[PDB]
Design a protein around this motif. Structure first.
Motif, PDB file in Angstrom:
ATOM      1  N   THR A 130       0.812  -1.215   0.000  1.00  0.00           N
ATOM      2  CA  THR A 130       0.000   0.000   0.000  1.00  0.00           C
ATOM      3  C   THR A 130       0.846   1.267   0.000  1.00  0.00           C
ATOM      4  OG1 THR A 130      -0.244  -0.009   2.415  1.00  0.00           O
ATOM      5  CG2 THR A 130      -1.954  -1.136   1.106  1.00  0.00           C
ATOM      6  N   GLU A 131       2.169   1.142   0.031  1.00  0.00           N
ATOM      7  CA  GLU A 131       3.067   2.285  -0.041  1.00  0.00           C
ATOM      8  C   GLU A 131       3.102   2.802  -1.474  1.00  0.00           C
ATOM      9  OE1 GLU A 131       5.025   3.968   2.382  1.00  0.00           O
ATOM     10  OE2 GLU A 131       3.586   2.929   3.674  1.00  0.00           O
ATOM     11  N   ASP A 132       2.989   4.127  -1.619  1.00  0.00           N
ATOM     12  CA  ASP A 132       3.004   4.760  -2.938  1.00  0.00           C
ATOM     13  C   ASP A 132       4.197   4.320  -3.781  1.00  0.00           C
ATOM     14  OD1 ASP A 132       2.418   6.340  -5.091  1.00  0.00           O
ATOM     15  OD2 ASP A 132       2.696   8.258  -4.063  1.00  0.00           O
ATOM     16  N   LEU A 139       3.596   0.901  -5.202  1.00  0.00           N
ATOM     17  CA  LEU A 139       2.666   0.924  -6.322  1.00  0.00           C
ATOM     18  C   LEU A 139       3.339   1.380  -7.610  1.00  0.00           C
ATOM     19  CD1 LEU A 139      -0.394   2.485  -4.474  1.00  0.00           C
ATOM     20  CD2 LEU A 139      -0.254   0.152  -5.341  1.00  0.00           C
ATOM     21  N   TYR A 192      -6.296   3.928  -8.586  1.00  0.00           N
ATOM     22  CA  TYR A 192      -5.070   4.709  -8.684  1.00  0.00           C
ATOM     23  C   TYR A 192      -3.955   3.910  -9.352  1.00  0.00           C
ATOM     24  CZ  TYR A 192      -0.925   7.267  -7.017  1.00  0.00           C
ATOM     25  OH  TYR A 192       0.269   7.942  -6.924  1.00  0.00           O
ATOM     26  N   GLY A 243      -1.135  14.657 -11.965  1.00  0.00           N
ATOM     27  CA  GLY A 243      -1.821  14.546 -10.687  1.00  0.00           C
ATOM     28  C   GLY A 243      -3.122  15.316 -10.584  1.00  0.00           C
ATOM     29  N   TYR A 284      -5.954  13.215 -12.210  1.00  0.00           N
ATOM     30  CA  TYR A 284      -6.435  12.187 -11.295  1.00  0.00           C
ATOM     31  C   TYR A 284      -7.310  12.805 -10.217  1.00  0.00           C
ATOM     32  CZ  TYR A 284      -6.671   8.538  -7.823  1.00  0.00           C
ATOM     33  OH  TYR A 284      -7.107   7.601  -6.917  1.00  0.00           O
TER      34      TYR A 284
END
Lengths: 408, 408
Positions: free
Chosen positions: A136-138, A141, A200, A227, A230
């Motif tokens: 779940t860490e950016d 991903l 995402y 960004g 999104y």
């Protein structure tokens, strides 16, 4: 070549063959929606790491030293029963700290670490909570998205180009391939935990598909790689108010969506533009349901059925490509893999000869695959360019090659 | 040392001095809200580029060659009257393609390109439309944020640390310094064009302030460095519905805001934590007005006045630091700059002796600055730790040094 119409009945023999033959057993098939029908991955993955290590050792006889330490560390970490906390901390260090030949080896190391994470979860050596803490860490991903895109491009792009299906490669369908199974478990866990994370991740993945030349276009995108875009899409999905005279701050998005729908439906537009618009619209609708829907001007202009038709066409072409690569592997005096760099080790190589009844099952699989498609696609004049034509051309190609390969 | 109370009257002599003396003329002052009161930058900037080039040439006598090409190209591009289209295309190439010594030189080149862009706009060599075409690109915004943060850190961090004001450095106040004027014009143009761009830039800038050790904290942030968090903040700002029993999808944000307000107001919390919470809350309220407001539990708990007090304290400490660096520059046999690497060339160096009446004007400036602050800060027991105490300590330090420096 005339297209095939043999319905769908008595498929017991084909279903059994696919469930007992490598690599078909490690993947699903479209022949599963018709209403008429481990413990080996460990030794397979272990041998691939040994072959990579052996090639690095040889090149140092001509910073390669650094790559060998990482390769040795991953082999050491995988074949040891240690505490979950230590595995998490050690693997994180490797992934975050990572000529033409050098880049290829560097990417494989990154992908193997994710395969190792995958194997530990299925064997219950790590719990669901520990897995979510990592993925779940950016940064994780972004690593998942880039490694998936780059690894897929490294392995099948040249193959797909030689057959002519490269334009139909769809980011939303790269996790159905037997070699990309680990990505699907991660996406499924994220969706169940928090649906916004899967959306995402999908947006990032398609942005990287665009960036690395998988979807080429002269003009820059209008929805991805920004960004703020999104943020606008997220703001739109969280709206109980169904746009009863909406505000001016989000009225430019509908114009952009309508321009892409107009281009897609325009039969006089260039093939390259229509497929790009299709890929853009397909991702938006999959992850932001309802964004591309606009009642009254959609019922007359058949749109939903056309998107379904192109999506089925893309799936079919991918399954055909896998079958083509499989048949092309059983040729006398091969000594090479058709599935990409470090895909199938010599020990687990595909047998040179045909097993009894294999040829008949393969022809039946092909025939059932082409017959199921035809009963669903839209046959008209406004779309018979993105669906029927490529399918016919592919059928023509496959039927010409099969009688040659089955005669030594 | 007793604090100063001399009101605000008869300030004509000080106002004139600051408007005619370098570098005070190139910046504003807080003494402007009290209701009681070019053509040289070109030659200054040109000489700085010549000194940088001269040092690179010497180091090659011991990839430095690449840095010299960029330095020569910027000098060549700046002193030539060409077409706007060619300037835009040439400058974009340089900026996108860009040991301890090497990094320092590399950053200066990047900053000089932005200074050159700035000078062309003011001389009407490029229009407003061409400027917006450049600076509205996401990559240009990320370059602006990183270069601003890194350049500010390179120049004043050691100075601020030796005096003790490093903890009060505020990202929202780095564009008031005379050397960072070019950033303010860009931010003002973006705000007028599209307010959402200034807010996105601010969020990025503070995220980089956190990332590069300007705001240290043991725990990871909860609002910055994550695209999803910006998406949530954006979704929140675009809401006509003023949360009449809001949804569960945005109810976790208020808990996080309340935890930070609780920490800030907690008089028993550590100094380091309270200032971090202050910096976090100040950026949110500046760029997302109303996000930190919550009626009924704010009127009794004086909050607004406390934020105003800390913000005034931060501004005052910055102006004092600039005055301290100025006085410390007029010392016999100096031969060095106190304003950082490549700040003031030898030709335009600050004169060694004091001009007639300068000492009196400086003391009057100091006295008026400390007297204006006291008439606005909150004097109580719950906050006299983030405002009055540092101001008193700074006053004690400045009054001890001035009588020494004014006697050779």
């Amino acid at each position: 070549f005339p297209k095939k119409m043999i319905t769908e009945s008595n498929s017991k023999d084909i279903r059994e063959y696919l469930a007992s033959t490598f690599p078909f057993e490690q993947q699903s098939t479209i022949l599963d929606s018709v209403k008429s029908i481990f413990d080996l991955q460990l030794k397979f993955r272990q041998e691939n790491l040994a072959e990579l290590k052996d090639q690095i050792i040889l090149s140092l006889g001509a910073n390669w030293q650094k790559l060998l330490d990482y390769t040795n560390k991953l082999d050491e970490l995988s074949n040891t029963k240690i505490s979950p906390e230590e595995f998490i901390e050690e693997i994180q260090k490797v992934l975050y700290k990572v000529s033409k030949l050098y880049s290829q080896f560097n990417l494989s190391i990154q992908d193997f670490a994710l395969q190792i994470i995958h194997s530990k979860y299925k064997s219950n050596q790590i719990s669901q909570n520990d897995l979510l803490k990592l993925i779940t860490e950016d940064e994780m991903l972004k690593i998942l998205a880039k490694t998936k895109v780059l690894t897929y491009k490294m392995k099948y792009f040249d193959s797909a180009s030689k057959m002519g299906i490269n334009k139909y490669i769809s980011t939303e369908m790269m996790d159905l391939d037997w070699q990309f199974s680990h990505y699907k478990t991660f996406n499924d866990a994220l969706k169940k935990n928090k649906a916004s994370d899967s959306s995402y991740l999908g947006w990032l993945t398609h942005g990287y598909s665009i960036k690395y030349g998988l979807s080429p276009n002269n003009e820059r995108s209008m929805f991805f790689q920004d960004g703020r875009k999104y943020a606008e899409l997220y703001a739109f999905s969280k709206s109980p108010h169904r746009k009863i005279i909406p505000g001016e701050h989000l009225k430019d998005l509908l114009a952009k969506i309508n321009k892409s729908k107009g281009i897609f439906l325009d039969q006089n537009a260039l093939l390259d533009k229509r497929i790009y618009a299709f890929h853009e619209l397909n991702t938006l609708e999959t992850h932001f349901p309802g964004i591309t829907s606009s009642f009254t001007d959609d019922l007359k202009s058949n749109y939903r059925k056309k998107m379904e038709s192109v999506s089925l066409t893309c799936q079919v072409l991918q399954e055909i490509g896998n079958i083509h690569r499989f048949i092309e592997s059983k040729v006398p005096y091969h000594s090479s893999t058709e599935y990409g760099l470090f895909s199938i080790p010599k020990i687990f190589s595909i047998p040179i000869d045909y097993k009894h009844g294999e040829k008949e099952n393969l022809v039946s699989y092909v025939d059932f695959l082409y017959s199921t498609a035809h009963e669903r696609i839209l046959q008209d004049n406004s779309i018979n360019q993105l669906c029927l034509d490529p399918l016919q051309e592919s059928l023509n190609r496959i039927k010409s090659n099969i009688p040659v390969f089955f005669n030594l």
